[PDB]
């Protein structure tokens, strides 16, 4: 049943969505959907059933910081985990995402090992 947790993987670079979804599959999570920007992601989220978001930052139409802030401000999903996975590596970028409620932060390019470590840190708090 834990492995039924529903992920939304958001990035305008489809190669990154593949990498993240495939790591999830190796960890036993197959209930995974994708979105290419924050608008498409928010539309999927508002439809219900999600339990974890993994999101890029720079994307057209709505970026990942805007998405994160929207999620955190929406009482229907305000505690949804949101893992930032972004090429933006400056301390001030990390601080901004953190202050906005990010559950974790991974810099691209990444190893699957790093990504797993960050996911586990959050799972640990989900009691998984
Ligand atoms: F475009 Be992302 F923030 F790497
Ligand atoms: Mn991007």
UniProtKB/Swiss-Prot annotation:
Residues 6-123 form the Response regulatory domain. Keywords: Acetylation, Chemotaxis, Cytoplasm, Flagellar rotation, Magnesium, Metal-binding, Phosphoprotein, Two-component regulatory system. It is found in: Cytoplasm. The modification 4-aspartylphosphate is found at residue 56. Binds 1 Mg(2+) ion per subunit. CDD domains: REC_CheY_CheY3 (cd19923). One of its GO terms (cellular component) is cytosol. One of its GO terms (molecular function) is acetyltransferase activity. GO terms for biological process: aerotaxis; bacterial-type flagellum-dependent swimming motility; chemotaxis; internal peptidyl-lysine acetylation; phosphorelay signal transduction system; regulation of bacterial-type flagellum-dependent cell motility; regulation of chemotaxis; signal transduction. Its main location: cytoplasm. Mg(2+) binds at residues 11-12, 56, 58. The modification N6-acetyllysine is found at residues 91, 108. Changing residue 91 to R: No effect on chemotaxis. It comes from the Bacteria. It holds the Pfam family Response_reg. Phosphorylated by CheA or acetylated by acetyl-CoA synthetase, depending on which acetate metabolism pathway is available. The major acetylation site seems to be Lys-91. Dephosphorylated (inactivated) by CheZ. Its cofactor is Mg(2+). NCBIfam families: PRK10610.1. PANTHER family: TWO-COMPONENT RESPONSE REGULATOR (PTHR43228), TWO-COMPONENT RESPONSE REGULATOR ARR22 (PTHR43228:SF1). Interacts (phosphorylated CheY) with CheZ (via C-terminus). Involved in the transmission of sensory signals from the chemoreceptors to the flagellar motors. In its active (phosphorylated or acetylated) form, CheY exhibits enhanced binding to a switch component, FliM, at the flagellar motor which induces a change from counterclockwise to clockwise flagellar rotation. Overexpression of CheY in association with MotA and MotB improves motility of a ycgR disruption, suggesting there is an interaction (direct or indirect) between the c-di-GMP-binding flagellar brake protein and the flagellar stator. This is Chemotaxis protein CheY.
């Amino acid at each position: 049943a834990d492995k039924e947790l529903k992920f939304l993987v958001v990035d305008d670079f489809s190669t990154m969505r593949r990498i993240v979804r495939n790591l999830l599959k190796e960890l036993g999570f197959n209930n995974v959907e994708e979105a290419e920007d924050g608008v498409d992601a928010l539309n999927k989220l508002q439809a219900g059933g999600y339990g974890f978001v993994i999101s890029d930052w720079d994307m057209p139409n709505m970026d990942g910081l805007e998405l994160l802030k929207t999620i955190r401000a929406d009482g229907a999903m305000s505690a949804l985990p949101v893992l930032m996975v972004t090429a933006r590596a400056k301390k001030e970028n990390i601080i901004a995402a953190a202050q906005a409620g990010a559950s974790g932060y991974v810099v691209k390019p990444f190893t699957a090992a790093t990504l797993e470590e960050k996911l586990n840190k959050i799972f640990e708090k989900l009691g998984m």
